[model samples]
Target chain A: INIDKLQDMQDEMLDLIEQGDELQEVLAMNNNSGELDDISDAELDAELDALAQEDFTLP
Target chain B: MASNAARVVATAKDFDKVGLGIIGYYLQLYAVELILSEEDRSQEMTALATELLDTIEAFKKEIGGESEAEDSDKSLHVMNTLIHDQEKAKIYMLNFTMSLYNEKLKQLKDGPWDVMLKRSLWCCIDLFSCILHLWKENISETSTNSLQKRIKYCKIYLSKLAKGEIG
Candidate 1:
């Protein structure tokens, strides 16, 4: 199932990687601890929800 | 082990550099290490290798992989080259530091300082040798105990030295 995406996920995955890196840097440089450094349990749940929402919206 | 032949380098810097090198090796290993498990080692390794290869490509895309044609990575390459050039200097400095402690041990003729010097040298050399092993082992697949057990032992030994344990 995961292997099915192998043919076409290259560019998207790379972009995701770049975006994640950028976000991490922004978070870290702005906040001493970083993206998860100060995240609470509620906030963590919210982040997971956001990812789920993103997948739900995906065609 | 020895980072400061030119200036005042702290032990912390040595610690960080050694750790980074180890991390680098591990990052380089993600491709095949998971396959070292009990089942379908080759198949699992191949699968992971493919995924890791993709990850490396993604990482390169973001970090801007070494551009051979553009001379962009020149500074990094030069620094790596220079660091290699300083290998001899590193050894010299390690020997010098150990010798200094050895001489101090000789002079003090007593006490915790002797054990301290021995412990200190052991740590310095352990850091050095472990970094080498880490480089070759490629951080991807070190045993779980590789770091934990040795570090626990080291801490115990250091604590004992601090408390003046001699035998």
Candidate 2:
């Protein structure tokens, strides 16, 4: 039961890695020439801020 | 004297459960060792590490061994056997942190700095937390302090990245 849930978590993490790589490639290609037009810098900043707020407390 | 059949079966089940848990923890340490020793297999070994952790957690829940108090005894024994000694384990911990730091440097060298930084930072946090949890009781205070320091540094760097101070 819980194994299925853990597998789903693993799959989700892998998906994040894949998606992040694709986004990184897109950003690299743009390279300050112009705005992304699709994703705003504000949105990215907000996401980063959220990640920064993640708790690293030991479990 | 003949043993009761049900009692024998229960004992066997207990042994099987504990044995599996021990093997699971041992394999995780082995995976970490492989990740440190084999550069070519780092990615694969890391995947194995993550998978093993997931499996162990699932198994713990399956057997209703979620309490740290109950699980700690077996985990400590497995760690002691696999890691050998405290000094060696400390070295492994130091090397593991260094490798992750170097990995972030590699990410910077290649493009996609932000994505890779986020990934590696998250990984460092997770891996360090796991190390601290598993070895907290086994290692000395000095080692624990150093590990905690490294963890703090990782978080600091990640926060800096978020602030766009450093990529």
Candidate 3:
């Protein structure tokens, strides 16, 4: 049982690391594409302002 | 020659970082041996084993606070807690084995190897040097390299106990 626990622990750690690496790659995929670059600072602040008024807080 | 002998003599007293790692490796082997034999360790060995665990707890404090020894998350899929906890357990076991080394070394301090089946401070020093060198070169919290090295030390250790007569 202890050995099983050890293997589980080792497996869990390795899996979590692999998952996190994948997440980073996914998040960084479009950095140079400038998806957000088309928007001006004013547009971002305006968007934030509109969202803030909607009370986006979950119930 | 005297200076060379003096070099292996432990100066700071407590197990250093590498010693802790080496002991941890030996402790893991020790545990496996017990499990495979389906035998109980003596009261003395058990007591030493408990002390080994406690001392390792102390070692964790030395390594870092709860947050210490945290490797990057990308490393090891890396559960930092799991890694640190596992590392601490490994570092603890070396204490018992090393204490035996010191005890035997003292008993044979003014010794001649011919008097016993096997005994020598120099032999003790060599074992210590070998362990230390192996640990420094190849060991880490998760390493198994030093496992084979234990066989080398075990031979010397067993021989030391064979003709055990001490002042």
How many residue pairs of model 2 clash at the backbone? 0
Best by TM-score: 2
Predictions in order: chain A TM-score: 0.32, 0.31, 0.35
Clashing pairs in 2: none
Task: List where candidate 2 sits over 4 angstroms from the true fold.
Answer: A1-49, A52-59, B1-94, B105-112
The window of 10 residues in a row where model 2 chain A has the poorest summed lDDT is A1-10
Backbone clash count for every predicted candidate, in the order shown: 2, 0, 3
lDDT of 2 by residue, A12-57 (tens): 3234345434534543554635333433444554555567445322
- TM-score to native of every candidate shown: 0.25, 0.37, 0.24
Q: In DockQ terms, which candidate is top?
A: 2
Off by over 4 Å in 3: A1-59, B1-38, B64-167
Q: Best to worst by DockQ, what's the order? A: 2, 1, 3
TM-score of chain B of 3: 0.29
Residue A53, model 3, lDDT: 35
Task: Tell me the TM-score that candidate 2 gets on chain A alone.
Answer: 0.31
Tens-digit lDDT track of model 3 for B69-146: 354223323323332554433332233334444354333334343433242333343444434443443465434344
Highest lDDT against the true fold, candidate: 2
Please compute the TM-score of chain B alone for each predicted structure, in the order given: 0.29, 0.43, 0.29
